[PDB]
């Protein structure tokens, strides 16, 4: 199927991810792959969409399991010879008043939101075809968390020259510092979720740079984004946006017209660049 | 007299960690272990601390000019300069890695040559009288050199080559691989090898500049091969342990005060080799 354009969404069985799959089914000229970690919930979501007259393909994917990521990589390489659109939407959050010890929240949330997302990029970024787009769903909480970090930490996270390996070290340091009970003293903010989304936002900046230096001329665009405050199982019902509204900026970034030079490596909210 | 300081890049594992261990034992003063990952770096320091050694730590990623410059500023403030610099940090793709060759060339060159070059640009001005600088190259540089066209060999063996000419040739290799013309343009097959030609020739150039600019300060700078060493880079079939691998770099870093040489040499098993 190498001649067919293909778009893929992670965490696509519910919430924002499902809304993105719906929009891409309608707007993307090619195949759309809904992925989910639970094959039973994934296939049920597909069946549900079929009842709305939409036909995304399905493939299992748990971003915490490197063998799951590699199986998907091999599938795409085999069927499509690559990938045109990748939406990294999968993510988790503990409740604001969750009693789980903070260092556990830090470790678990970082494991999925940062390391899982990073592993998907490691394995799938090489497969992105020319004119392809990559969208990492972050959060405006990443900016709030950034501004709540020590000046030392802010300088590192805003750097234009930070490397993936430096970022990995800083993300692991946050998790270790919470375990040692010293995260406040070491300059970190109080939202584990927020810090993991700093990782996502900064990883996007790093990867956009890497694309510009390794794939000049291939016209690939990669950005981080915030979907806004969306009524899903994550945020609950007090939120102001429907999932369909939440999907608007991610879809915009996925479908940027061919030959666009930007936005690239930007943090985007309501289709506009936010200063990092 | 006063405080002396020695610093190793890529010190958290492999040959670098072994060099740090040796320097902690043999170098009187502070020995700074640096690593790009602060978590791995501090774990490495803890490991040495369990052994009775007391290395200092500072973050350093040689791909990040701001990281290099932060280290430069730290060294100036804390020590007023640097006595020993070991440029050990390096990467290699596997022999059978499926990554496109032109990407292997770009990524390997970015670290091994350009990163090493940036550390030298920023830290060489800080080297104190009787200081020593050791650039960890590889015998793969000689093997790569001998695999270049006669015309390229002439350029790389030149006693008059400039840093800027060498930069242009390293960038030319990376460009030629992307264009799919590197073999025709006279380049060898090992990207890693070509990056270490860069390291070896940069060392010759910098020794020459030290002699021009800072004669009388008795600084010695050399390239070396640690040999074939069992690390995450080479694997378990290699013939040397990391401690054995550290022997030549440590010998070059600790050359006695006032020694006239070696300087600007490529050294292996503590012996000067022909370039
Ligand atoms: N206000 C909001 O809702 C905001 C949300 N976000 C971000 O939007 C994205 C989507 O969140 P939202 O739709 O709200 O949340 P939901 O909880 O409703 O959906 C999250 C999706 O991610 C999946 N997921 C979680 N972990 C994994 C993993 N290990 N592997 C594969 N899939 C996984 C879930 O699968 P499963 O059903 O199996 O649990 C689910 O499909 C997240 O990244 C979130 O951080 C950002 C800003 C605001
Ligand atoms: N092993 C061998 O047979 C030989 C090795 N060499 C050279 O010896 C040196 C050490 O290699 P070896 O110990 O085998 O390799 P290892 O992979 O075991 O260790 C390499 C070290 O370099 C660090 N490093 C890599 N890139 C960077 C960077 N961007 N910034 C800071 N540190 C970095 C690594 O950090 P991290 O842990 O974060 O990756 C690690 O500490 C290299 O220059 C290599 O080319 C030369 C001849 C033979
Ligand atoms: N205790 C958690 C709180 C995380 C959190 O912010 N939770 C949810 C409420 S459960 C959220 O919806 N955040 C979404 C966003 O706006 O990005 C932590 O420190 O990580
Ligand atoms: N595909 C690579 C291969 C690099 C390579 O030679 N391998 C490393 C990995 S096995 C090594 O261990 N030897 C290093 C040395 O002897 O200096 C390239 O062309 O650069």
Q: Half-sphere exposure of A39 toward its Cβ, with a 13 Å CA cutoff?
A: 3
DSSP state for residue B11 in the 8-state scheme: -
Q: Which residue of A has its CA nearest to B98?
A: A126
Strands B220-225 and B127-136: parallel
B130 close to B219: Cβ distance less than 8 angstroms = yes
Q: Which residue has the tokens 């599938």?
A: A75
What whole-number distance in Å separates Cα of residue B21 and Cα of residue B64? 25
CA A39-A43-A45 angle, to 5 degrees, is 120
Tokens of A150: 């020590």
A48 close to A19: Cβ distance less than 8 angstroms = no
CA-based nearest residue to A26, from A230, A247, A235, A241: A247
A8 close to A33: Cβ distance less than 8 angstroms = yes
What whole-number distance in Å separates Cα of residue B272 and Cα of residue B203? 14
What whole-number distance in Å separates Cα of residue B201 and Cα of residue B210? 14
Tokens of A177: 């510092």
- Report the DSSP beta bridge partners of residue B6: B31, B84
For residue A121, what are the CA distances in angstroms to A69, A170, A207? Answer: 10, 18, 9
3-class secondary structure per residue, B27-91: CCCEEEEEECCHHHHHHHHHHHHHCCCCCEEEECCCCCHHHHHHHHHHHHHHHCCEEEEEECCCC
Which ligand is nearest the CA of B226, by number?
2
B140 close to B196: Cβ distance less than 8 angstroms = yes
- Preceding amide of B186 cis, omega within 30: no
**CATH C-level class of A1-276:** alpha beta
Closest CB to B39 among A161, A169, A213:
A169
B16 lines ligand 2 (CB under 6 A): yes
Q: Which residue of A has its CA nearest to B65?
A: A161
CB atoms within 10 A of CB B254: 15
Q: Which residue has the tokens 């509204």?
A: A245
CA-based nearest residue to B133, from B59, B61, B67, B83: B83
What whole-number distance in Å separates Cα of residue B63 and Cα of residue B238? 27
- B 86-105 residues inside an 8 A Cβ radius of A: 99, 103
3-class secondary structure per residue, chain A: CCCCCEEEECCCCCHHHHHHHHHHHHHCCCEEEEEECCHHHHHHHHHHHHCCCCCCEEEECCCCCHHHHHHHHHHHHHHCCCEEEEEECCCCCCCCCCCCCHHHHHHHHHHHHHHHHHHHHHHHHHHEEEEEEEEEECCCHHHHHHHCCCHHHHHHHHCCCCCHHHHHHHHHHHHHHHHCCCCCCCCCCCCHHHHHHHHHHHHHHHHHHHHHHHCCCCCCEEEEEECCCECCCCCCCCCCECHHHHCHHHHHHHCCCCCCCCCCCCEEECCEEECC
What whole-number distance in Å separates Cα of residue B228 and Cα of residue A131? 43
Tokens of A158: 């805003």
A229 close to A185: Cβ distance less than 8 angstroms = no
Using the Cβ of B171 and the Cβ atoms of chain A, whether some distance falls under 8 Å is answered with no
What whole-number distance in Å separates Cα of residue B66 and Cα of residue A152? 13
Residues of B with Cβ-Cβ distance to A162 under 8 angstroms: 64, 66
Closest CA of chain A from B271, distance in Å = 35
For residue B172, what are the CA distances in angstroms to A1, B20, B164, B166? Answer: 37, 35, 12, 10
**Virtual CA dihedral for B240, B246, B249, B250, nearest 10 degrees?**
-140
**Virtual CA dihedral for B202, B204, B210, B216, nearest 10 degrees?**
160
Burial (Cβ within 10 Å: 0-12, 13-18, ≥19) of residue A195: buried
- Domain layout of chain B by residue ranges: 1-275
Strands B30-35 and B82-87: unpaired
Distance (Å) from CA B222 to ligand 1 centroid: 54
What whole-number distance in Å separates Cα of residue B226 and Cα of residue B236? 16
Tokens of B86: 């070991």
CA-based nearest residue to B147, from B171, B105, B183, B97: B183
For residue B102, what are the CA distances in angstroms to A96, A122, A232? Answer: 47, 18, 44
What whole-number distance in Å separates Cα of residue B34 and Cα of residue B7? 7
Residues of A with Cβ-Cβ distance to B38 under 8 angstroms: 169-170, 173
Using the Cβ of A169 and the Cβ atoms of chain B, whether some distance falls under 8 Å is answered with yes
A193 lines ligand 3 (CB under 6 A): yes
What whole-number distance in Å separates Cα of residue A131 and Cα of residue A260? 9
A204 marked as part of a ligand binding site:
no
What whole-number distance in Å separates Cα of residue A269 and Cα of residue A248? 10
Using the Cβ of B179 and the Cβ atoms of chain A, whether some distance falls under 8 Å is answered with no
B60 close to B68: Cβ distance less than 8 angstroms = yes
Closest CA of chain B from A46, distance in Å = 34
Tokens of B251: 């010998």
Distance (Å) from CA A265 to ligand 1 centroid: 22
Burial (Cβ within 10 Å: 0-12, 13-18, ≥19) of residue B122: middle
B258 close to B201: Cβ distance less than 8 angstroms = no
A91 lines ligand 1 (CB under 6 A): yes
A139 lines ligand 1 (CB under 6 A): yes
A95 lines ligand 3 (CB under 6 A): yes
DSSP state for residue B146 in the 8-state scheme: T
Residues of A with Cβ-Cβ distance to B37 under 8 angstroms: 165-166, 168-169, 172
First to last CA, chain B: 38
Using the Cβ of B38 and the Cβ atoms of chain A, whether some distance falls under 8 Å is answered with yes
A266 close to A223: Cβ distance less than 8 angstroms = yes
Tokens of A149: 């970090």
Closest CA of chain B from A202, distance in Å = 15
DSSP state for residue B114 in the 8-state scheme: I
Tokens of B249: 């770099």
Resolution in A: 1.8
CA-based nearest residue to B16, from B89, B82, B83, B113: B89
**Enclosing H/E stretch for B165:** helix B163-179
Beta carbons of B67 and A166 less than 8 Å apart: yes
- Preceding amide of B262 cis, omega within 30: yes
B6 close to B30: Cβ distance less than 8 angstroms = yes
First to last CA, chain A: 39
- Report the DSSP beta bridge partners of residue B31: B6
DSSP tally for chain B: helices H, then strands E = 11, 8
3-class SS of residue B214: coil
CA-based nearest residue to B136, from B260, B14, B255, B22: B14
Beta carbons of A161 and B103 less than 8 Å apart: no
Strands B271-273 and B266-268: antiparallel
Q: Which residue of A has its CA nearest to B39?
A: A169
CB atoms within 10 A of CB A263: 20
3-class SS of residue B222: strand
Q: To the nearest 5 percent, what fractions of chain B are helix, strand and coil?
A: 50, 15, 35
CB atoms within 10 A of CB B179: 11
Tokens of A142: 């990443």
Closest CA of chain A from B29, distance in Å = 28
A167 close to A197: Cβ distance less than 8 angstroms = no
What whole-number distance in Å separates Cα of residue A235 and Cα of residue A32? 26
Tokens of A100: 């789980």
Tokens of A139: 């959060």
What whole-number distance in Å separates Cα of residue B12 and Cα of residue B57? 10
Q: Half-sphere exposure of B158 toward its Cβ, with a 13 Å CA cutoff?
A: 15
3-class secondary structure per residue, B234-265: CCCCCCECHHHHCHHHHHHHCCCCCCCCCCCC
B64 lines ligand 2 (CB under 6 A): no
Distance (Å) from CA B234 to ligand 4 centroid: 7
**Enclosing H/E stretch for B132:** strand B127-136
3-class SS of residue B227: coil
A192 lines ligand 3 (CB under 6 A): yes
- Residues in CB range of A275: below 8 A, 6 or more apart: none
3-class SS of residue B219: coil
A18 marked as part of a ligand binding site:
yes
B195 marked as part of a ligand binding site:
yes
What whole-number distance in Å separates Cα of residue B40 and Cα of residue B59? 10
Tokens of A102: 């903070």
Which residues of A are part of the catalytic machinery?
A: 193
Burial (Cβ within 10 Å: 0-12, 13-18, ≥19) of residue A35: buried
B1-275 belongs to which homologous superfamily? NAD(P)-binding Rossmann-like Domain (3.40.50.720)
Beta carbons of A159 and B61 less than 8 Å apart: no
A141 close to A193: Cβ distance less than 8 angstroms = yes
């Amino acid at each position: 199927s190498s001649g067919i354009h293909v778009a893929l969404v992670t965490g696509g069985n519910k919430g924002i991810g499902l809304a993105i799959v719906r929009d891409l089914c309608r707007l993307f000229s090619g195949d759309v792959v809904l992925t989910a970690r639970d094959v039973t919930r994934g296939q049920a979501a597909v069946q549900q969409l079929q009842a709305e007259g939409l036909s995304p393909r399905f493939h299992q994917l748990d971003i915490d399991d490197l063998q799951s990521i590699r199986a998907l990589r091999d599938f795409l390489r085999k069927e499509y010879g690559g990938l045109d659109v990748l939406v990294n939407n999968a993510g988790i959050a503990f409740k604001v008043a969750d009693p789980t010890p903070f260092h556990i929240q830090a470790e678990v949330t970082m494991k999925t939101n940062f390391f899982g997302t990073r592993d998907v990029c490691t394995e799938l970024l090489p497969l992105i075809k020319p004119q392809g787009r990559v969208v990492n769903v972050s959060s405006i909480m990443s900016v709030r968390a950034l501004k709540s970090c020590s000046p030392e930490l802010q300088q590192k996270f805003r750097s234009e020259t930070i490397t993936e390996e430096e970022l990995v070290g800083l993300m692991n340091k946050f998790v270790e510092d919470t375990k040692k009970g010293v995260h406040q003293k070491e300059g970190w903010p109080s939202s584990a979720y927020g810090v993991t989304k700093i990782g996502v936002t900064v990883l996007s900046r790093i990867h956009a740079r890497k694309l510009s230096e390794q794939r000049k001329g291939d016209k690939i665009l990669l950005n981080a984004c915030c979907p806004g405050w969306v009524r899903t199982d994550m945020a609950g019902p007090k939120a102001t946006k429907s999932p369909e509204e939440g999907a608007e900026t991610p879809v915009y970034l996925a479908l940027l017209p061919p030959d666009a030079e930007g936005p690239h490596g930007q943090f985007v909210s309501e289709k506009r660049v936010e200063q990092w």
